[PDB]
Amino acid sequence: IPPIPPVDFAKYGEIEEVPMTRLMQIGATNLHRSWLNVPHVTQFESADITELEAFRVAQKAVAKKAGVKLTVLPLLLKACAYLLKELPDFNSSLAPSGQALIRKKYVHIGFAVDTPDGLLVPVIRNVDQKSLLQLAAEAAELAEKARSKKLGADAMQGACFTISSLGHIGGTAFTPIVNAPEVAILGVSKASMQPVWDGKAFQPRLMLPLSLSYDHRVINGAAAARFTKRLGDLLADIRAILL
Amino acid sequence: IPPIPPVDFAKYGEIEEVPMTRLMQIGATNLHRSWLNVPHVTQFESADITELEAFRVAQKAVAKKAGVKLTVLPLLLKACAYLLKELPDFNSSLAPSGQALIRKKYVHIGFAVDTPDGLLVPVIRNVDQKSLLQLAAEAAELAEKARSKKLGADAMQGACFTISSLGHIGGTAFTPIVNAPEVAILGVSKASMQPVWDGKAFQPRLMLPLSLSYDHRVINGAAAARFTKRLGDLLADIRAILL
Ligand SMILES: CC(C)(COP(=O)(O)OP(=O)(O)OC[C@H]1O[C@@H](n2cnc3c(N)ncnc32)[C@H](O)[C@@H]1OP(=O)(O)O)[C@@H](O)C(=O)NCCC(=O)NCCS
Ligand SMILES: CC(C)(COP(=O)(O)OP(=O)(O)OC[C@H]1O[C@@H](n2cnc3c(N)ncnc32)[C@H](O)[C@@H]1OP(=O)(O)O)[C@@H](O)C(=O)NCCC(=O)NCCS
Ligand SMILES: NC(=O)CCCC[C@@H](S)CCS
Ligand SMILES: NC(=O)CCCC[C@@H](S)CCS
């Protein structure tokens, strides 16, 4: 690939060199390797989380009594786990022959924690088997270890799918990069109150923005529009996971 | 126990003798054995199932596509299974020494099917592990076999707890008899629309009547009022099973 020509930047004013951490350098190499290997598409969708949110908020005491804080991440993790089993092509990886998919029968999901040294993506194993307060506790443990440089490489391995949430900061949508060899990543941005047509008038509904990027060699446009459709439906009534 | 004196019933008019099936005779002996062994109390409670009902009704297509019909029995079975694990004294039996309880670590639940030959109580094993449509299908299979005299004694064994539902016929509450050696049985009667105080005015809420009878040697009044309280809370928001 052609390199970028170097520029004498000091010709235009004062410059200062600061170095990158090794974590950043690893980060950079992996993103660029994903970028060039994966033909990326992003499918955008909005989910109605008005009731999910009122559930989250009422279980605040139960959560506090358990010493965990119930955020949105466990509710996303649980729904994505159910879905990674309903639609197994999203839970798989392209075999190195390029002629086979390796379907995984396990669901482990990573989540992006941006730390000062750089990006870490801790993995929660068997997300399909744990409960909202278990996932709540573990997510928080893993993120604290990640921030404290005390996360062991053991916990950064063999994820199936990644959730990347920037909802705590802002934004409307973004296009995340697939964390190859995984085949998809869900970006989540900030929920807003929004007018939604009910057949007669517009009703304010709390809308969550989802941005699914996927590896188009393995997932086609319709499979991906179906994944964000189902996910928006599960987040609108999470009781459907019960059936 | 003193017997009832025989009466010449034909002295008062015409009589006819019809005989009881062996099933009825077994039924009769067991009820009387339970009656005399178990000091019975019944704890009554009403659960607000307005939203559970609207869930049930919306999943009608999913259920039809799966070939099952989603009634209320699976939603009761799932909630009682969660509860039989939260409050383990309800999932146990009095040891024959009378000085120990045997706590069971498995949840299998029976349910009363009244058939022409008499009462049968088929058992669904590991209710805690199956899903609403799995329990829906199995419940219906078992009840058809029960009606058809094709249920094998295998499926009438080792239940932990019994649900007895007469909601399909009518009534306000009743006092069921504990199916000993189990320690409790939930009777369910007919749901009605009811005014419920919201702090300001009365709101119509669809109320389900529950009648828990229990073996008072093993369960005390407060443990039982706590079981129907929790069950009414889980049926009001079944998503709490998720956490
Ligand atoms: C469990 C944990 C790992 C992730 O939590 P989270 O789901 O991001 O939620 P947080 O509590 O961090 O979010 C901060 C606030 O923004 C809110 N927020 C989160 N997602 C939101 C969304 N998508 N839309 C709008 N607001 C959102 C939170 O609910 C929270 O509100 P509060 O301060 O009133 O409680 C958390 O303990 C943690 O470490 N948080 C730090 C932020 C982070 O790195 N998140 C990465 C998730 S991929
Ligand atoms: C799954 C099965 C075993 C039990 O079903 P169920 O939960 O009793 O529900 P049913 O569909 O039989 O009930 C008949 C109707 O009364 C309704 N009903 C049931 N419980 C009710 C309640 N507690 N309050 C008010 N109405 C109720 C049902 O929802 C159903 O309505 P529909 O005809 O409009 O669909 C069912 O297939 C069956 O065999 N039913 C026959 C009745 C029976 O023996 N039930 C025993 C349960 S312990
Ligand atoms: N884990 C890594 O070392 C590479 C960076 C992560 C890939 C995704 S999270 C990029 C999101 S935009
Ligand atoms: N199973 C039996 O043979 C005995 C009868 C059942 C006990 C309960 S269901 C009575 C309910 S009122």
Residue nearest to atom 10 of ligand 4 (CA): B177
Q: State the ligand closest to the CA atom of A161.
A: 3
**DSSP structure string for B180-202:** TTSSEEEEE---EEEEEE-SSSE
Q: Residue A170 phi/psi, 5° resolution? A: 160, -175
Q: For residues B38 and B27, what is the distance between their CA atoms, to the nearest angstrom?
A: 16
Instruction: Please tell me the total number of residues recorded for chain A in this structure.
Output: 243
* Tokens 């459709």, residue located: A229
Single out the residue of A119, A74, A91, A124 nearest to residue A241, CA to CA.
Answer: A74
Query: In chain A, what are the domains?
Result: 1-243 (3.30.559.10)
Is B191 a pocket residue for ligand 2 (Cβ < 6 Å)? yes
C-alpha B52 – ligand 4 centre gap (Å): 28
Which 3-state string (H, E, C) describes chain A? CCCCCCCCHHHCCCCCCCCCCHHHHHHHHHHHHHHHHCCEEEEEEEEECHHHHHHHHHCHHHHHHCCCCCCCHHHHHHHHHHHHHHCHHHHEEECCCCCCEEECCCCCEEECEEECCEEECCEECCHHHCCHHHHHHHHHHHHHHHHCCCCCHHHHCCCCEEEEECCCCCCCCCCCCCCCCCCEEEEECCCEEEEEECCCCEEEEEEEEEEEEEECCCCCHHHHHHHHHHHHHHHHCHHHHHC
Which 3-state string (H, E, C) describes A114-167? EECCEEECCEECCHHHCCHHHHHHHHHHHHHHHHCCCCCHHHHCCCCEEEEECC
Quick count: other Cβ atoms within 10 Å of Cβ B226? Answer: 16
Torsion region of A14: left, alpha or beta (phi above 0 gives left; psi -120 to 50 gives alpha): beta
Q: Cα A148 to the chain's mean position, in Å?
A: 21
Chain B residues near residue A240 by CB distance under 8 angstroms:
59, 62
Identify how the structure was determined: X-ray
Contact B237 A55 (CB under 8 A): yes
Residues of B with CB under 8 A from a CB of A: 55, 58-59, 62, 70, 78, 131-133, 237-243
Q: For residues A11 and A75, what is the distance between their CA atoms, to the nearest angstrom?
A: 52
Q: For residues A109 and A158, what is the distance between their CA atoms, to the nearest angstrom?
A: 9
Q: For residues A126 and A160, what is the distance between their CA atoms, to the nearest angstrom?
A: 10
Chain A residues near residue B76 by CB distance under 8 angstroms:
none
Torsion region of A230: left, alpha or beta (phi above 0 gives left; psi -120 to 50 gives alpha): alpha
Quick count: other Cβ atoms within 10 Å of Cβ B208? Answer: 25
With beta carbons less than 8 A apart as the criterion, state whether B43 and B176 touch: no
Q: State the ligand closest to the CA atom of A72.
A: 1
Q: Residue A90 phi/psi, 5° resolution? A: -80, -15
Residue nearest to atom 17 of ligand 1 (CA): A168
Sign of the CA dihedral A59, A60, A62, A67? positive
With beta carbons less than 8 A apart as the criterion, state whether A84 and A90 touch: yes
C-alpha B74 – ligand 4 centre gap (Å): 20
Contacts of B100 (CB under 8 A, 6+ apart): B94
Contacts of A50 (CB under 8 A, 6+ apart): A205, A206
Q: Cα B135 to the chain's mean position, in Å?
A: 15
Measured CA to CA in angstroms, residue A55 lies from A79, A185, B87 at distances of: 15, 25, 24
Contacts of A224 (CB under 8 A, 6+ apart): A41, A43, A184, A212, A214
**DSSP structure string for B126-164:** -GGGS-HHHHHHHHHHHHHHHHTT---GGGGS--SEEEE
**Residue type at position A92:** S
Per the DSSP assignment, residues forming a β-bridge with B194 are B205
Residue nearest to atom 9 of ligand 1 (CA): A71
Measured CA to CA in angstroms, residue A208 lies from A72, A117, A167, B24 at distances of: 10, 29, 9, 59
Q: Cα B172 to the chain's mean position, in Å?
A: 15
